[PDB]
Design a protein around this ligand. Structure first.
Ligand SMILES: [Zn+2]
Ligand SMILES: [Zn+2]
Lengths: 17, 47, 66, 145
């Protein structure tokens, strides 16, 4: 239980906002 | 590498308690808290 | 606590009749005319639904979360 | 350091910040590691965790929420950052060489590999840290806020 990403959870961008 | 997870009373949030810890919730502050179900095999006879 | 599945004496399925029977009583049926509109003839099967007290509605008030 | 693989040991992923949103000594463990922050379209740059700043924007990261910032900088382009745009992706080759060129282009010395080796263990000691002091209390005060 250290980094269970399996990618990821849709990392939001900085230039998207 | 299993940290012995508890469920709070008033919060219902899983906390990690290792030994030598205060039993308190990681939020809201609660001194009562319960344990999670087992992982072993529960098999009943519908009887 | 929750409606038994079967009549203890007979064997007949009464588990599917608690909602229908509370709905008929809400409509206007008298309690003896609701019990045979559901199709319960023997008085063995009829006490399952008259005598039943529903506690699970009170036990559901104690939410674990929310 | 000439390798994006050793650089990933001190690469801070997204699943590790959530555990230390309220652990103190924060400006002492994370300052010296490298994160994979997002710019946006799938391009990324290796920015430098410089200081611990706070935003007036409280945003939720999954279940947890955190309004803090990160003083990141890619060589010379430095600005504020939030904790949601970081990538769980490891240091690739093109981004490792891009960061190498941004550091050779800025005049910043590349941190010696022994520094990374002495920095990566700070994380593992901070993870197995026994919270016997009064950190639970400030943690709950910081979570309720
Ligand atoms: Zn507590
Ligand atoms: Zn019967």
């Amino acid at each position: 239980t250290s980094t269970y990403g399996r990618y990821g959870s849709q990392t939001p961008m900085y230039g998207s906002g | 590498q299993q940290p012995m997870i508890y469920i709070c009373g008033e919060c219902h949030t899983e906390n990690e308690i290792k030994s030598r810890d205060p039993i308190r919730c990681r939020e809201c502050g609660y001194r009562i808290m319960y344990k999670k179900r087992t992982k072993r095999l529960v098999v009943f006879d519908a009887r | 606590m929750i409606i038994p599945v079967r009549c203890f004496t007979c064997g007949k399925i009464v588990g599917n009749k608690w909602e229908a029977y509370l709905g008929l009583l809400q409509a206007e049926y008298t309690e003896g005319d609701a019990l045979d509109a559901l199709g319960l003839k023997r008085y063995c099967c009829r006490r399952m639904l008259l005598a039943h007290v529903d506690l699970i509605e009170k036990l559901l008030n104690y939410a674990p979360l929310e | 350091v000439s390798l994006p693989e050793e650089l990933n040991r001190v690469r801070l992923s997204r699943h590790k910040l959530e555990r230390w949103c309220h652990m103190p000594f924060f400006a002492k463990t994370v300052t010296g590691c490298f994160v994979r922050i997002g710019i946006g379209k799938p391009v990324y740059r290796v920015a430098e965790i410089t200081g611990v700043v706070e935003t007036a924007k409280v945003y939720q990261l999954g279940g947890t929420r955190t309004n803090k910032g990160l003083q990141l900088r890619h060589g010379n382009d430095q600005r504020v950052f939030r904790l949601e745009f970081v990538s769980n992706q490891e240091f690739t080759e093109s981004e490792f060489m891009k960061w190498k060129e941004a550091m050779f282009s800025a005049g910043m010395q590349l941190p010696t590999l022994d520094e990374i080796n002495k920095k990566e263990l700070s994380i593992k000691e901070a993870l197995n840290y026994k919270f016997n002091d009064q950190d639970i209390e400030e943690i709950v005060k910081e979570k309720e806020r």
